[PDB]
Design a protein around this motif. Structure first.
Motif, short mmCIF file in Angstrom:
data_model
loop_
_atom_site.label_atom_id
_atom_site.label_comp_id
_atom_site.label_asym_id
_atom_site.label_seq_id
_atom_site.Cartn_x
_atom_site.Cartn_y
_atom_site.Cartn_z
N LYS A 1 -72.91 68.81 97.93
CA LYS A 1 -74.20 68.77 97.23
C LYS A 1 -74.73 67.35 97.17
CE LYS A 1 -75.18 72.50 93.94
NZ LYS A 1 -73.93 73.26 93.64
N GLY A 2 -73.87 66.40 96.83
CA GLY A 2 -74.22 65.00 96.82
C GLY A 2 -72.96 64.18 96.72
N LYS A 3 -73.07 62.91 97.08
CA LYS A 3 -71.91 62.03 97.05
C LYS A 3 -71.32 62.01 95.65
CE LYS A 3 -71.46 61.19 101.17
NZ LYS A 3 -71.27 59.80 101.66
N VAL A 4 -70.00 62.18 95.58
CA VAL A 4 -69.37 62.42 94.29
C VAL A 4 -69.32 61.13 93.50
CG1 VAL A 4 -67.13 62.86 93.23
CG2 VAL A 4 -68.03 64.44 94.95
N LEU A 5 -69.67 61.22 92.22
CA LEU A 5 -69.58 60.10 91.30
C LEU A 5 -68.40 60.39 90.38
CD1 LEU A 5 -70.63 57.60 89.56
CD2 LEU A 5 -72.03 59.30 88.37
N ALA A 6 -67.37 59.56 90.46
CA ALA A 6 -66.21 59.70 89.60
C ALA A 6 -66.44 58.93 88.32
CB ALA A 6 -64.94 59.22 90.30
N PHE A 7 -66.02 59.51 87.20
CA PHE A 7 -66.26 58.87 85.92
C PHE A 7 -65.07 59.10 85.01
CE2 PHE A 7 -68.83 62.79 86.54
CZ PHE A 7 -68.01 63.68 85.87
N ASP A 8 -64.86 58.16 84.11
CA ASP A 8 -63.86 58.35 83.07
C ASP A 8 -64.37 59.42 82.11
OD1 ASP A 8 -63.18 56.14 84.51
OD2 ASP A 8 -62.69 54.87 82.78
N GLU A 9 -63.45 59.99 81.33
CA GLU A 9 -63.88 60.99 80.36
C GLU A 9 -64.91 60.40 79.40
OE1 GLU A 9 -60.52 62.58 78.35
OE2 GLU A 9 -59.39 63.01 80.19
N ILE A 10 -64.77 59.11 79.11
CA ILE A 10 -65.71 58.39 78.26
C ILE A 10 -67.04 58.15 78.97
CG2 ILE A 10 -64.53 56.28 78.96
CD1 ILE A 10 -65.38 54.95 76.43
N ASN A 11 -67.00 57.93 80.29
CA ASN A 11 -68.21 57.62 81.05
C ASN A 11 -69.23 58.75 80.97
OD1 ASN A 11 -66.52 55.81 83.77
ND2 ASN A 11 -66.84 55.34 81.60
N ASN A 12 -68.78 60.00 80.97
CA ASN A 12 -69.71 61.11 80.77
C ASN A 12 -70.42 60.97 79.43
OD1 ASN A 12 -69.85 62.64 83.07
ND2 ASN A 12 -68.71 64.40 82.26
N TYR A 13 -69.68 60.57 78.39
CA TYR A 13 -70.27 60.37 77.07
C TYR A 13 -71.28 59.23 77.06
CZ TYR A 13 -65.80 62.79 76.25
OH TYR A 13 -64.72 63.64 76.32
N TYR A 14 -71.02 58.16 77.82
CA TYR A 14 -71.87 56.98 77.76
C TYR A 14 -73.31 57.30 78.15
CZ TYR A 14 -69.00 52.98 76.47
OH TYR A 14 -68.28 52.05 75.76
N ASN A 15 -73.50 57.97 79.29
CA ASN A 15 -74.86 58.30 79.69
C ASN A 15 -75.52 59.24 78.68
OD1 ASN A 15 -73.87 56.92 81.92
ND2 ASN A 15 -73.62 58.78 83.16
N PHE A 16 -74.73 60.14 78.09
CA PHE A 16 -75.26 61.03 77.06
C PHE A 16 -75.75 60.26 75.84
CE2 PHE A 16 -72.08 64.47 78.63
CZ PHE A 16 -72.82 64.61 79.79
N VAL A 17 -74.98 59.28 75.38
CA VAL A 17 -75.30 58.56 74.15
C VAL A 17 -76.63 57.84 74.27
CG1 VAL A 17 -74.58 56.67 72.65
CG2 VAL A 17 -72.91 58.37 73.39
N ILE A 18 -76.88 57.19 75.40
CA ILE A 18 -78.12 56.44 75.59
C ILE A 18 -79.33 57.36 75.54
CG2 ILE A 18 -79.34 54.85 77.12
CD1 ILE A 18 -76.96 53.58 75.94
N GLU A 19 -79.20 58.58 76.08
CA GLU A 19 -80.33 59.50 76.14
C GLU A 19 -80.86 59.86 74.76
OE1 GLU A 19 -78.48 62.65 78.22
OE2 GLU A 19 -77.92 61.37 79.91
N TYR A 20 -79.98 60.07 73.78
CA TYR A 20 -80.43 60.53 72.46
C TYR A 20 -81.37 59.53 71.80
CZ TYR A 20 -76.39 63.66 73.11
OH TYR A 20 -75.48 64.57 73.60
N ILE A 21 -81.00 58.24 71.81
CA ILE A 21 -81.85 57.24 71.17
C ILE A 21 -83.13 57.01 71.95
CG2 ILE A 21 -80.20 55.99 69.73
CD1 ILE A 21 -80.09 54.05 72.34
N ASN A 22 -83.06 57.10 73.28
CA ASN A 22 -84.22 56.76 74.11
C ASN A 22 -85.45 57.57 73.71
OD1 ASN A 22 -82.67 54.93 75.46
ND2 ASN A 22 -82.71 55.98 77.44
N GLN A 23 -85.26 58.86 73.42
CA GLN A 23 -86.40 59.71 73.09
C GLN A 23 -87.01 59.35 71.74
OE1 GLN A 23 -83.87 62.96 72.93
NE2 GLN A 23 -83.49 63.11 75.14
N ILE A 24 -86.19 58.98 70.75
CA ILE A 24 -86.71 58.74 69.41
C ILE A 24 -87.65 57.54 69.40
CG2 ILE A 24 -84.51 59.67 68.61
CD1 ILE A 24 -84.06 56.89 67.23
#
Lengths: 410, 410
Positions: free
Chosen positions: B154-177
């Protein structure tokens, strides 16, 4: 949490038609028919056209992969404390991974367990071995989990509970794994961590539904056992009534109007040939102040209804026989200010209440069948003391009444 | 978990230059300069241009709303049990909200305290009033959190730590407010759910850092305390050597070549006027089998090296004086198969070893300064017993030697 109850084999009940294999929350500015919020399988606001209830349950497919059953996770964790470490992929076998765990699970269960501590759990695992690994995880109806639309600076955004995030995350992880044919040729060893996160999210989904029961599902149901909130109910102060039969009572203008409103609206619509909404306007006008016309409709109902207009009167605590009584509405008061129920002094001893400002609950009974069954609770039936078979002094003459008969005879 | 150390005011350390406000890791098919995975702020190990170490830390701004300090959450929870309920909206102040809790924290903290049990925690909260509320959240360098390169269909695989998935999520919540300035019209604050989940996500991120400490970060430091893995080290079996002084020993051909590989190549490059890559080729050939030419360079090195060619010989357990001894490389053996260190019999008693096939550890010392400092452990310096000041019998004549002198004199 931990309960002993029948387990369900998801594969047998699984329905391919309501399968959510599309992770996209929205598709091309529209709610996905294959999405979690799917009108076709779950229903929509026009639920009467759908003929699909809240009971509609979606499905997600993890095939060709299996996860630990979320409900059965805790017992396995007690049996195998290292379950959290072993499932991750990074004795003879240590921290092999979820797929490897499945192949050696029977040996591993014997390998790392204390029989005395967890024998019941181990026996349960033997009994429900077939249900340990799950291919399909259910998702409950979107009607239960609402997604409210809000306006956003960049663009309109959908606010929804974390449960929806848990579901869509799970589908997003799985969707890519099945697609890859030539990516997977040697990637399969680091594909295992992706499955691990799915298991944890499903566990939180299970925990959230447990919290959902606390948040007005089981809490509300057990609160109903604590106190079922009945419509067609009333509370009123009691005042002595003289000159009328014991079973008959006098009810204030406001009390009768609300409880028998729909019965009242029926007569006004029939008599005046008006729409139900227009009849409500007549009832609303009557509520404000005493008008003879609405009083006439109320008087006719008490006079002409089959079996009379009857209700149940309970004084709490309802700890004694006669606490709840089946009585008849003999009269409707013509004073708007008078808001006291008129009861015979003989009834008071059975209820055990007092005319000290105490309030009694009024629950009217409508069905003629229900009226007959609750007539066994009438004061007339309670004239006989149930322990002795003798006449009950609770319904006998009271202080003022005894004196007059005494002066007459003695 | 029961740790006491100085707290940090993030606002003091906050840098606008190292600000991560973009949740997308990649921009236009390259690593985003403002993204979580930013070569711009953290660097790239391959190209020297980065000039930035791991110590580089990114920054995030959560204003105009504040979150509970992640490290202090458990301390706040013990004092205030309703913190979990209060922050979300669903005692008297149950479920008031995070912003309401922030305004009324002093009232709530006094309201919820244990006089005996949590007095110490309350005093700490008084001490650190300024650090209770967090406006800036740190994000650690992307260099520490690796993204393993893999190919996906589907696309080149991006490997991430279990925390790395959380990091992109955390930034999104504040960005909208923050995007909406006038949008909310004060009609409906949905920012609290976004902030609420973020606190748990950062807390789990903090717990992940604890697991990251478990995953070879502080543990590796403890591994050095348990056993620092020293390069330029060797192990060899001991065999008796006769005809050489007590301090001098015989070292095998392979042992000297590897330990002094970089020293040897310097000479080979200079003598033959060849590139270091070409000199390495000669070293590889000599290691495979004995060649007179490499032996000659080694023979010259041991003879002409400043301070001599010296090393440290330790027999474990290193519990006694003389367990580690500073010794000299007198000769290099000419047999490739012979891999036994030749030591004087007098050294054996101090070391406490025996010629039974046990192996002793060899740690060579290179710097001339270290050689003098470690020469305080030499056998000659230990000829004096530190306990008495008398001669050390460990370095005296042993069983076979005593017999010859006894026959000579008596």
């Amino acid at each position: 949490m931990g309960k002993k109850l029948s387990l369900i084999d998801f594969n047998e009940i699984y329905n391919e038609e309501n399968l959510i294999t599309r992770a996209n929350p929205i598709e091309n500015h529209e709610f996905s028919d294959d999405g979690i919020y799917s009108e076709r399988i779950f229903g929509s606001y026009n639920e009467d056209d759908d003929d699909k209830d809240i009971d509609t349950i979606g499905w997600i497919n993890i095939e060709p992969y299996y996860i630990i059953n979320p409900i059965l996770f805790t017992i396995i964790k007690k049996c195998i404390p290292s379950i959290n470490k072993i499932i991750n992929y990074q004795g003879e076998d240590d921290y092999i991974g979820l797929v490897k765990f499945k192949d050696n699970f029977d040996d591993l269960l014997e390998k790392y367990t204390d029989k005395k501590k967890y024998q019941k759990e181990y026996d349960f695992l033997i009994e429900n071995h077939d249900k340990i690994f799950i291919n399909k995880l259910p998702v409950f109806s979107h009607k239960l989990r609402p997604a409210t639309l809000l306006t956003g600076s960049k663009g309109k955004v959908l606010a929804f509970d974390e449960i929806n995030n848990y579901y869509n995350f799970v589908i997003e992880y799985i969707n890519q794994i099945n697609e890859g044919v030539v990516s997977d040729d040697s990637i399969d060893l680091l594909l295992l961590p992706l499955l691990y996160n799915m298991q944890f999210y499903a566990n939180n989904i299970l925990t959230r539904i447990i919290s959902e029961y606390l948040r007005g599902k089981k809490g509300f149901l057990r609160k109903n056992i604590m106190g079922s909130r009945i419509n067609f109910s009333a509370r009123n102060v009691i005042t002595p009534l003289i000159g009328h039969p014991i079973d008959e009572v006098a009810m204030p203008y406001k009390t009768f109007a609300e409880l028998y409103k729909f019965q009242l609206i029926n007569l006004i619509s029939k008599v005046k040939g008006i729409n139900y909404n227009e009849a409500l306007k007549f009832w609303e006008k009557g509520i404000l102040g005493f008008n003879q016309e609405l009083y006439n409709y109320m008087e006719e109902l008490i006079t002409k209804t089959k079996g009379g207009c009857t209700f149940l009167l309970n004084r709490n605590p309802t700890i004694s026989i006669g606490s709840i009584l089946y009585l008849k509405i003999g009269l409707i008061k013509k004073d708007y200010k008078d808001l006291t129920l008129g009861i015979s002094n003989n009834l008071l001893s059975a209820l055990s209440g007092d005319y000290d400002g105490d309030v009694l609950n009024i629950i009217p009974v409508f069905d003629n069948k229900m009226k007959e069954h609750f007539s066994l609770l009438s004061p007339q039936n309670f004239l006989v003391d149930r322990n002795n078979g003798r006449f009950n002094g609770d319904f006998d003459l009271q202080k003022d009444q005894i004196l007059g008969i005494f002066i007459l005879n003695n």
